[PDB]
Ligand binder design. Sequence first.
Ligand SMILES: *Cc1cc2c(cc1C)nc1c(=O)[nH]c(=O)nc-1n2C[C@H](O)[C@H](O)[C@H](O)COP(=O)(O)OP(=O)(O)OC[C@H]1O[C@@H](n2cnc3c(N)ncnc32)[C@H](O)[C@@H]1O
Ligand SMILES: *Cc1cc2c(cc1C)nc1c(=O)[nH]c(=O)nc-1n2C[C@H](O)[C@H](O)[C@H](O)COP(=O)(O)OP(=O)(O)OC[C@H]1O[C@@H](n2cnc3c(N)ncnc32)[C@H](O)[C@@H]1O
Ligand SMILES: O=C1Nc2ccccc2C1=O
Ligand SMILES: O=C1Nc2ccccc2C1=O
Lengths: 494, 499
Amino acid sequence: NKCDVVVVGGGISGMAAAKLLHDSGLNVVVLEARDRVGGRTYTLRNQKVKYVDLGGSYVGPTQNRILRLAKELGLETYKVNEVERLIHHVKGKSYPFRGPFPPVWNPITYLDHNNFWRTMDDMGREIPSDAPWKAPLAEEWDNMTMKELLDKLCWTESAKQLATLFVNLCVTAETHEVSALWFLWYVKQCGGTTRIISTTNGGQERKFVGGSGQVSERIMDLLGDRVKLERPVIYIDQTRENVLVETLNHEMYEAKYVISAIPPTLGMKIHFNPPLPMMRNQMITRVPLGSVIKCIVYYKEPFWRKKDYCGTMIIDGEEAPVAYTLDDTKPEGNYAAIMGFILAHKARKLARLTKEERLKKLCELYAKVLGSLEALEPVHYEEKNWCEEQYSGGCYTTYFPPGILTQYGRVLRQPVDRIYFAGTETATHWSGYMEGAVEAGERAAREILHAMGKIPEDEIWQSEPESVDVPAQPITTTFLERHLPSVPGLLRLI
Amino acid sequence: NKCDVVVVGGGISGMAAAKLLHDSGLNVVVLEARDRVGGRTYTLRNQKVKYVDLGGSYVGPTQNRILRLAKELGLETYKVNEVERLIHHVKGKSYPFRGPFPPVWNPITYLDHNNFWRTMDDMGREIPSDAPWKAPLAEEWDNMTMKELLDKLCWTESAKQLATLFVNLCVTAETHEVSALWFLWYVKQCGGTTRIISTTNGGQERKFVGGSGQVSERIMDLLGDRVKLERPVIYIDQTRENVLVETLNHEMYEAKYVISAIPPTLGMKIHFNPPLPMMRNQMITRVPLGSVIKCIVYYKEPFWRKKDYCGTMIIDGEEAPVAYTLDDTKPEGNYAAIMGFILAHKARKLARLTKEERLKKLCELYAKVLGSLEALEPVHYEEKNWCEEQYSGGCYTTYFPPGILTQYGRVLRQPVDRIYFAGTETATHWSGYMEGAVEAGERAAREILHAMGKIPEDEIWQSEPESVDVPAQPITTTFLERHLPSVPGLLRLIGLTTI
Ligand SMILES: *Cc1cc2c(cc1C)nc1c(=O)[nH]c(=O)nc-1n2C[C@H](O)[C@H](O)[C@H](O)COP(=O)(O)OP(=O)(O)OC[C@H]1O[C@@H](n2cnc3c(N)ncnc32)[C@H](O)[C@@H]1O
Ligand SMILES: *Cc1cc2c(cc1C)nc1c(=O)[nH]c(=O)nc-1n2C[C@H](O)[C@H](O)[C@H](O)COP(=O)(O)OP(=O)(O)OC[C@H]1O[C@@H](n2cnc3c(N)ncnc32)[C@H](O)[C@@H]1O
Ligand SMILES: O=C1Nc2ccccc2C1=O
Ligand SMILES: O=C1Nc2ccccc2C1=O
């Protein structure tokens, strides 16, 4: 029944919000639709895998909030294996390489690739993290898709194909599905192209020992019976003195404030009284989540290491079910595994297959790319198709189709009377990630503390000290990378 | 509690479905979220206006299902005024014209305009009405916005600007918001560019005497207490022998089958057990409705007629709040009024204003376009911003952003166990319209009749006899319209003569 704040959703964002409010002495209730916490994180345990992250997994430098929260809850990280060579598989052939970026040898192609990434970061510098619609060319960039931008910028097919893979991997969506403004914001707010795409010194550097699901689980442990599982919220009524929140299983909660910690579009599953303001009413129909199947194939040994491959594969082309992999072997060297993503349209295309059929396709692909018959001998397989989840809508996160961010972006985290908005989609740094979930949950909690007159306005948004365990190395460029001409630039010199 | 079929939604589609099922002898219940039926149709009555359609209003030739349904319910139509000259207002000046379309005099610009509409219809012919994802270039066309297509096809700004207005008006969305495949399908499934855009011989030919809301109201009258108002559906459970449908006001309905007669995305307001299959689960997050404020300014007299203007204004330019108007005067010649739409981004931009502020902007615009100080003297004003409606999501209808129709379109009307899908969005002819609502509601009802073994499979989709009251003239082209070159075609010809 009665409390200070009802938090809708027990993912990392809702849990982080509820923990902050609880720690500040307020009575909080978390209403969670599923029979588990964690949301877009989910750690499965069984004897064959020990544990495996089937949802969000990776953390890395500059993600100081999730690192701090997890540390406080008693979690540790380990490094994703990147000791040996990465592979870029293109036109049916594997090209091993060292460093974060696949080498390009044709000189014109080199200029084209160099210019593309440079231009993405250059454009990002004009986009405010907290207000992408305030970019000088916001409308121009929002009114084109990433496909149109790539078509404009890439003078080579090589660059266009790799840029396409990059978009598909970062946002689990096709280049033609997403706004260029939104995508450029998305990369910039993760620290740029190098930071978002890198394992060492980037977003994929580390995983949590025992799984990321432990973040939400351990906060649920702290909160005890304040977390109500299998309580999908169906109705929020703000017409009276206290806010009334009703669940599907016919319970009523009464609170001073509510935090909505669910993906924006999942606000549609709640009937509002009074109705939402027009802009939010339409916004929540305009913001889908991406499409992905996360697939983990287990082997007797991390056999790829013997061939001086780390397990990272960047696989171009329509035929390959999986465009990107990482080594998912445990820090101890056992439960050898390759994690791969079936991205965007391929998640839709291949969802029809059986689990065994997807396993066979992945093993055959890996055998080709790793040049090893050992890939054909899996000992176990786990997968999760996030497209099927009623209470997620997809993964990793919400994307904005052309025209939406400039028209509706302003209302994403605008309070609606006594409802405040958390969820990783409302973050300004690593929005889309567990890091963003923490930022947004804690910010939304502090908005309520401010509304209650408990903290001053300047304490709503709080900086985070850098992790001592996961220090960030700066991203650097060389003189040549900065100054080499684009393809049209070299043509203009002729 | 118990019935044969629960229909979710009491708009025209749900009402048409319920009526067909009721007439066939089944026990139906309609669960309607609002305190009224009609949905995206809404006829306001007061003394100042008598009646006015604030939602869907127009019907026309080839929309034979809505015409037949409305006729059976005792309704009559009248013709929208198009006697006098139309106006095209471009770059701050009005150019009156007759016949359907603004004349283009510049031979280059004329070639460009001619080619644009022709190409739209040419492309449409490649798109199956019942399966647009089967078009030979479906992926190519679905992966670009209408903005990209216009940028490719229009060699003049004049054609691009008019094409933009056309898209904004047809689908209450910006050219950069919508898939080219979906928009080309949308126009084709209305009979093409001429049919969709025309008043005389087109979609906007007529209105119902007394308002379109009467369609849903009169079916409610027939169904009696089978229509349950203020019953928003929150939960559908298909795990047991009979389907269970729960409403927000804590009632449970049990049925053999369900028809979902709501906009596809509003399916999100329902919690499903078991969960929807993956494709539908994601589809219903990918399909927004457009944005529009329908505004009606009333005057003492239809003064524009005295200046030989019918009241139709096609108004280009960012500054104009309204891009399109029609005379909304009653057939008797009283309650003189101009209907205008505030479209797409402008509905968002101008929603912040007060009603009085929007009225002032509209009157000042109309005074300019009509060259008439009388437009500054309104006697009354009504408006409805459909973007604010929890149980519509927008108007007129659902649009598909780039990439969606090819990836998810197949599941739009695919049954989910014992849930069948109605709603105008699932129609194959005039989807988006009252006509499409009738087609889809009746088709969904007949899918259930087939499931019950009451009718054979070939009776699910049923042709409609042409209206005797609203005959359709064929859409024709001239030899020159067919064969005149595009601008690049002309340039190719010039280059060949030069070489
Ligand atoms: C799915 C996915 C995500 C992902 C990823 C790979 C996959 C396959 N890779 C990641 C990575 O390696 N590193 C990283 O930081 N994140 C990556 N992600 C994304 C990450 O998982 C998400 O950004 C993060 O988990 C989102 O957290 P947030 O708390 O903002 O949102 P949520 O997890 O979706 O939680 C929402 C909760 O709300 C419940 N819910 C939904 N509707 C209701 C209603 N109506 N009532 C009550 N509860 C509701 C959901 O069940 C969920 O628990
Ligand atoms: C809004 C609009 C529409 C419109 C138009 C101008 C405007 C401003 N111009 C039109 C025109 O002149 N000619 C024409 O034929 N149509 C034009 N339209 C479009 C037209 O209004 C629609 O195509 C048609 O009315 C759609 O009918 P349909 O029956 O398919 O859908 P609906 O009217 O939206 O009805 C849905 C009903 O379902 C109820 N609902 C919604 N959610 C729930 C839940 N969860 N539970 C129970 N009921 C629910 C809605 O309240 C609604 O009544
Ligand atoms: O899980 C992941 N999320 C990502 C986002 C960008 C690049 C790689 C990855 C992953 O491996
Ligand atoms: O109401 C309307 N719907 C339309 C669709 C296309 C063109 C004109 C109109 C109207 O006037």
